[PDB]
Design a protein around this ligand. Structure first.
Ligand SMILES: O=C(O)C1=C[C@@H](O)[C@@H](O)[C@H](O)C1
Ligand SMILES: [Cl-]
Ligand SMILES: [Cl-]
Length: 168
């Protein structure tokens, strides 16, 4: 089982925080998006484009459940994994870190050329605010630790996480 599962919107810093956290904990980091691509042999964009989000979510839930049982390091979950009831159920009992971010900062961090089926222009900020409004309650429901990644440089966040993981 994972030492910690990271959840949050794209741009919340799961990849960077997860990489620095894994290093601090002396373990490996597994991103479920990467696991989905490795198992299916398909890009995430291709699944959404041809098979649709519904099928993508079923695939993702299966991969997430597998990782929760077999990965012993840090697990980062795709931004929308929590929309699946089965995923929230599987997270029960795990240490789950919710990386919180404001819509403004999240939008700024996701303005690159990374392909994002659910965060493509135009009106990207509007779409981001929409995802945040809908998923905020879900992240909160599964989280055992809520962390603010706004202004707080990465390093400070990782340190904050390591301390809260070690003490009551
Ligand atoms: O916000 C989402 O629902 C997603 C986030 C990415 O990690 C990928 O899992 C995919 O693009 C869907
Ligand atoms: Cl669909
Ligand atoms: Cl980007």
């Amino acid at each position: 089982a994972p030492k910690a599962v990271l959840v949050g919107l794209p741009g919340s810093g799961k990849s960077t925080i997860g990489r620095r956290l894994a290093k601090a904990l002396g373990v490996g980091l597994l991103d479920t998006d990467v696991a989905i691509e490795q198992r299916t042999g398909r890009s995430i964009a291709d699944i959404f484009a041809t098979d649709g989000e519904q099928e993508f979510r079923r695939i993702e839930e299966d991969v997430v459940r597998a990782a929760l049982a077999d990965h012993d390091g840090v697990l980062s979950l795709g931004g929308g994994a929590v929309t699946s009831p089965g995923v929230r159920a599987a997270l029960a009992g795990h240490t789950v870190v919710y990386l919180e971010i404001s819509a403004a900062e999240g939008v700024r961090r996701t303005g690159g050329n990374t392909v994002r089926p659910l965060l493509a222009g135009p009106d990207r900020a509007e779409k981001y605010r929409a995802l945040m409004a809908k998923r905020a309650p879900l992240y909160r429901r599964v989280a055992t630790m809520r962390v603010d990644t706004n202004r707080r440089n990465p390093g400070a966040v990782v340190r904050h996480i390591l301390s809260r993981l070690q003490v009551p």
